[PDB]
């Protein structure tokens, strides 16, 4: 089998099939005609992501939320139950609790790392088990293989949001997951210029999602133009993730030596709670770092406002380094003790480590750390 | 208030606000940063404001597709126990969404003739939350009395949603007739060049805000690409000129078909024989570019007609510069059987034409030639 | 033979040969393995519209002009030009190729006697625009062509003002036609592009020499696709530009503040007859002169609220310029007239917006001036 | 000063100035009302990477080269050229500007004594590539710059092969640098573009003369945006290109079918020392000569399954070419020799694919070349 990098560049395409074009032409057309009485650009992206993820088929959508909703609207119906990881991406949480959850679908959050508890929460109604790994809060890891075994016993469908790792660092399908969902807007695109989502899994499941969730319940159609840009980004996925991870590791070790830092959440540190599990499922620790300042919410606010290279934003996986402090940002409306509920610390700061020179990033952080004193 | 053409070209944008750029720059960025610890795309926002102006509404919302607009709207407005009244015939995928989608999540569905104001009111219940229909409706251009149902909906407290794809704001403005919301498959006439897929919702700020923050944000994620939104605005700049041409060509072709021996019946709002001729002229400033007619030869003449076309393309879509034609019996519903189609109001010889922008003489010759071949 | 509108939409493309795609896929690729189909389609379609054998697509109007002349001329060669030319074209001939041993001479392309007297054995090319930027000055294309053949010179006409929809120089004897597709062809002011249409022999030479080696004015497939998109409504847009322009022109002709009007659609137009012989419609460009001179023109411009103050034309948006206070803010009354640039000359690129809105803007500005 | 990668991603742009947009909006507009921002950002960024004062963006590498030379030269002037040049550049000089009174002379830019001896009061420009396509022949940039400075000649270096990440001629004395951004800068083979970087004085002249009036090789803003996108991973891509090429070069050097191999990264490379003095890494291009001559080459090329048979380089996909049976197929064996092109010469633009896959393809094709 050709290597990952080779497939990310060539899988599913032969220039001789399109007039010798080295780069596939963009099928920016809404409709196709018939000689007598699917979009190729999108089909290539899908086959390529399926190949990288180690799955039978792929589906491309307008956004990560488009992929999540199309998938869940397809697999769930009133009466069905869905077990969820204890923490989820903001909009995913809203979708479940304020969306499909208000339509007769039962929801329940369980620690996906606690196989005992998971086995206990299972019921004959449990139709889907959905979670992210690592999870948005403090990189909580889930035992994918362990969860898949239980799910396989009860006949439940396992859906894993693999946004953070990408197929390059983790492949849940190879660990038992039935479906993998991605916000391709992040690492896959890698350049923060498109919004897109991806679904990969068995031909049977993906066909259903395509013809039901996407076609009829969301209409989250991805533009061929953006699909092309996404494939452009995927061509450097391995190289970009290597740098993201190498930069993050150095930055994490630097932060671990800071007096002002109380706690550090990074899979690459030996003191990481689930260090062993992470290494079992991930080939590299990732480009995301979560940490807490001893000064609480005030220290985080000052740290954030002093950053000059890092950007204050909510996304991740871009060439540019990004930082966010939920306490004084996304969750600024949530009162102190109230904020703690969602697991958000008052001094919790999350960094999406970019591709810029590491010493420049270390210098920005060092400089900002001084301003949060 | 400036004229329609003027607003379709200028509304919401002043070059002086973006370094003098005559054409607004495309914000192809997924994220925006903040200067301090304490989010909408300018390209989509312009598109939305412009469509709101054209439709005469308070606010607009842009989505990845027409279905994205329809699903985001309905997922927002409906919850189990709610009832939605539907026009008797709907777009294939919309019907599917309703009966195999949201309808399977506890929402009650009921089809009613939206042209029959008495029947519609008779179907109103305290659970009725939404009234949804297309006008004209896909099958045979059946019209709905928009102002009429709007009055009823107002007396019973239901939200009126009209799919205005076929007419576009240039030919019909439901919001001005009393509708609360209008949805569009911008993929059709608005884009006008068949190169993008997009949807639009226009209505009150209250309703659109909810759809944006609920349906779109959490339930569909049908986000429109800034690149496509820019192309959509490019297409809208010639909307009046294109619709004028689509209609002029369609009227000519319609009057032609009405004189052909192979044609059994014709459904075109512009012909005096159209059953709802009077209602149509009251809601539409022009008869449209869509023609539906039936061949006497049945499903055989249809297939023959379709295969003989040289200029018109055999495809399932409409509103493109290129003329398109389709025969449901031998295309979209071919799988089904005569009875099946009969039930859905689809005759064996029903052919639908989306009259394009090419030379009418070339169009007439293509249809003439294909009609002869339908023998 | 399909009509113009039909060809502008279908010529050279059949979905069957591209997986059924109604709209041709965009070949955004720098190279191929073992000519770009998107550019070829655009070229083939433009050739059909202009009625020529071959077409060539370039990065800009200037790319088309330079690539053409760089190919056809060499030191010692002589080129005859119309008395007036687009600013950058003038700069190119006099400050560019004219500085590499190529001889230049301007002649009134409407005065056949003068053109024949200006012809020499060294005359290799005859280049001009028609109508000509200044005040719509027309050139007798068929007439200049007859002289060119007799002498064996190549006739190149810049046809961006009319577009193949209103005028086709090739059918009047021209050998090559050049366009700033940036204008009316695109029609939406979002791309910069150039087009050359002519015989296969001439175009092949320009492609392989001027473009490939001397300018590198390569058009992006993305922009070529947008250009074809614009071309699909060319007939409709030009119809409206002309209809709007005629109304505005007749209006200006009744206003006291206006001393003179330059519009082919008015019977008073000096070359009315010739114009109607080469152009199917009078066009969407209007040039007129205010009585108040540069001061009035300046007041007129600053008062405009719908028309935009910019230098370009052929856009959906109406545009206006006053050379004396804009492109020629420099100079003085002398040099101005030295180039036929009246102190009160205002040029309008009449857009597609509602004629009532356009009239209101012009009326208000007209009052504002004076 | 921030590092190269940091500048490749951030230089010249601050989100705050554009509504907080992380990625700068694309100014896809032909005109402005009362200098394209997208093009300006690309230019300022390229200038920073190359360590120059200003940059200019054009439609293609040839647009950059022609705009540059058309501006700096005039009849009577002389230009000294490296011995071997890119195909189209050679054609531009000999069949283009060289036919307009400009004197041309080829000199080995590695031989400083010959260079000095070739200097004349008429020498206005010294143009060359380094490495030079053929066999990666290097030029002593600082050496030639010192000479040009003494005589007052402008030094222009085509730096596309190395990119600013591996070599910065400006820092070595060159006055101007040109790039076919279509290659490594873009890195994904989907756009055609050129870049010129140098002093504000030289770049201003090239923009207002060469480009504006003599070539019109304008770059599409959409393409400039894609180019900036590619530049954000330049360092990462070049590191991989170089790593893969080194391994492939060392492999090829040990193969029986290989008679001569040209890769700057091999200790035995003739100008190994000079190369390392100017380039931070040996590059992703490899040229080698097969023993079986033209027949072996054609055999080798047809057997390739991963490498694509094409004429270009700097793409994520590996590309290979055999001049004798491809671009130079029409010449005679002697004519090719005259240009330093062996009948068995094969050039490889090593891509980003997995090295083990690249090795297997080359190995397998090597056996078939027999």
């Amino acid at each position: 089998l050709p290597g990952f990098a080779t497939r990310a560049i060539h899988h599913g395409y032969d220039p001789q099939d399109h007039g010798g074009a080295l780069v596939p032409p963009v099928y920016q057309t809404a409709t196709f005609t018939f000689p007598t009485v699917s979009n190729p650009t999108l089909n290539l992206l899908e086959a390529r992501m399926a190949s990288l993820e180690g799955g039978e088929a792929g589906l491309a959508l307008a956004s990560g939320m488009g992929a999540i909703t199309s998938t869940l609207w397809t697999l769930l119906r009133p009466g069905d139950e869905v077990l969820l990881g204890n923490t989820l991406y903001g909009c995913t949480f809203a979708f479940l609790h304020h969306g499909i959850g208000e339509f007769g679908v039962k929801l329940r959050h369980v620690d996906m790392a606690d196989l005992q508890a998971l086995e206990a929460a299972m019921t004959p109604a449990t139709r889907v088990i959905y979670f992210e790994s690592p999870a948005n809060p403090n990189m909580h890891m889930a035992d994918i293989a362990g969860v898949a075994k239980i799910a396989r016993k009860h006949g439940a469908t396992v859906v894993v949001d693999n946004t953070y790792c990408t197929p390059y660092l983790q492949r849940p399908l190879e660990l038992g997951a039935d479906l993998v969902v991605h916000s391709a807007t992040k690492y896959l695109s890698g350049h923060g210029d498109i919004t897109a989502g991806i679904v990969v899994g068995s031909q049977a499941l993906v066909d259903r999602i395509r013809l039901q969730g996407l076609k009829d319940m969301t209409g989250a159609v991805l533009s061929p133009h953006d699909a092309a840009l996404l494939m452009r980004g995927i061509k450097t996925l391995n190289l970009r993730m290597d740098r993201h991870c190498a930069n993050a590791q150095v930055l994490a070790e630097f932060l671990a030596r800071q007096p002002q830092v109380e706690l550090i959440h990074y899979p690459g540190l030996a003191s990481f709670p689930q260090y062993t599990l992470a290494r079992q499922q991930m080939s590299q620790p990732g480009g995301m770092i979560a940490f807490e300042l001893k000064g609480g919410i005030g220290a985080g606010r000052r740290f954030m406002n002093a950053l000059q290279l890092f950007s204050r934003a909510v996304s991740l996986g871009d060439a540019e380094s990004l930082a966010q402090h939920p306490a004084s940002m996304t969750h600024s409306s949530y009162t102190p003790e109230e904020r703690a509920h969602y697991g958000i610390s008052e001094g919790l700061v999350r960094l999406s480590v970019g591709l810029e020179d590491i010493d420049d990033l270390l210098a920005d952080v060092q400089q900002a750390l001084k301003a949060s004193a």
Side-chain angles (χ1 to χ4, degrees), chain A:
Chain A
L1 172 66
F4 191 100
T6 302
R7 287 181 284 125
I9 296 170
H10 299 281
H11 191 82
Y13 186 71
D14 176 355
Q16 297 187 184
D17 304 309
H18 276 71
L22 270 175
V23 178
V26 183
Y27 285 74
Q28 188 80 206
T29 182
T31 326
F32 296 72
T33 71
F34 312 82
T36 64
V37 64
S38 66
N39 185 293
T41 292
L42 278 298
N43 296 331
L44 182 60
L45 161 65
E46 290 167 353
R48 199 163 282 175
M49 279 303 294
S51 171
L52 297 186
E53 201 59 271
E56 295 171 358
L59 181 64
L61 302 89
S63 69
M65 284 314 293
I68 296 169
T69 57
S70 295
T71 294
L72 298 182
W73 279 128
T74 299
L75 278 26
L76 297 164
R77 279 299 182 291
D80 291 353
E81 187 198 21
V82 52
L83 295 180
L84 313 163
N86 281 319
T87 60
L88 295 165
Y89 173 70
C91 293
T92 301
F93 181 107
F95 169 52
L96 289 162
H97 289 282
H98 300 142
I100 186 167
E102 292 184 356
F103 286 84
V105 174
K106 196 190 312 305
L107 317 168
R108 176 197 272 225
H109 292 277
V110 177
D111 185 333
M112 295 299 160
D114 185 339
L115 299 181
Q116 312 83 289
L118 188 281
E119 172 61 66
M122 298 295 276
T123 75
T126 302
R127 184 57 266 181
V128 176
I129 293 177
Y130 183 85
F131 63 85
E132 299 163 35
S133 188
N136 292 178
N138 51 49
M139 275 55 260
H140 182 70
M141 306 288 178
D143 195 332
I144 307 177
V147 169
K149 189 179 182 185
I150 295 180
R152 201 174 308 120
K153 209 288 287 296
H154 297 68
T157 300
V158 180
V159 181
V160 178
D161 184 324
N162 198 210
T163 295
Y164 273 35
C165 296
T166 83
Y168 182 61
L169 306 191
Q170 173 177 274
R171 293 178 287 280
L173 296 182
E174 295 176 358
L175 285 167
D178 295 296
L179 289 164
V180 169
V181 157
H182 283 99
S183 169
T185 305
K186 314 315 199 314
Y187 288 112
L188 293 178
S189 159
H191 303 70
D193 54 356
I194 57 168
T195 296
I198 292 285
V199 172
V200 176
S202 63
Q203 189 71 224
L205 290 170
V206 177
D207 284 359
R208 292 174 57 198
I209 300 166
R210 174 191 297 275
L211 306 185
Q212 295 165 47
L214 171 58
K215 175 181 154 292
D216 307 323
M217 295 187 273
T218 65
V221 176
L222 178 67
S223 169
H225 171 275
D226 294 38
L229 278 178
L230 176 50
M231 287 191 275
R232 193 186 207 264
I234 290 159
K235 288 183 179 182
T236 55
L237 176 65
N238 64 123
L239 300 180
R240 293 185 290 97
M241 298 307 288
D242 279 351
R243 185 50 58 94
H244 281 300
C245 292
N247 279 169
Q249 184 73 214
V250 170
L251 195 46
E253 296 184 3
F254 172 78
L255 273 46
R257 299 185 304 180
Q258 300 313 301
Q260 310 103 306
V261 177
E262 210 171 15
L263 194 59
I264 296 289
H265 301 304
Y266 186 66
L269 299 184
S271 61
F272 186 64
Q274 293 172 293
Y275 188 64
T276 308
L277 207 200
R279 314 199 73 194
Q280 277 174 40
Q281 310 186 318
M282 302 165 76
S283 53
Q284 298 188 64
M288 304 299 293
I289 299 177
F291 71 95
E292 310 163 0
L293 291 302
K294 291 182 177 176
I297 188 179
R301 180 185 60 259
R302 281 183 299 162
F303 172 78
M304 293 296 303
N305 290 326
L307 295 165
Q308 301 308 295
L309 185 51
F310 270 80
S311 264
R312 285 165 285 281
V314 60
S315 191
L316 67 301
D318 297 324
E320 297 80 354
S321 287
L322 310 178
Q324 63 153 37
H325 173 199
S328 58
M329 282 169 70
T330 56
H331 298 294
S332 57
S333 63
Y334 281 74
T335 55
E337 36 60 66
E338 176 186 302
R339 190 187 305 85
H341 174 57
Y342 280 57
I344 288 64
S345 176
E346 65 303 303
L348 178 63
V349 176
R350 187 190 73 181
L351 307 181
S352 171
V353 189
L355 305 177
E356 41 278 285
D357 291 285
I358 188 61
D359 187 63
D360 292 345
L361 293 172
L362 286 164
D364 194 30
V365 169
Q366 169 179 249
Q367 167 278 307
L369 237 31
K370 182 182 298 182
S372 74

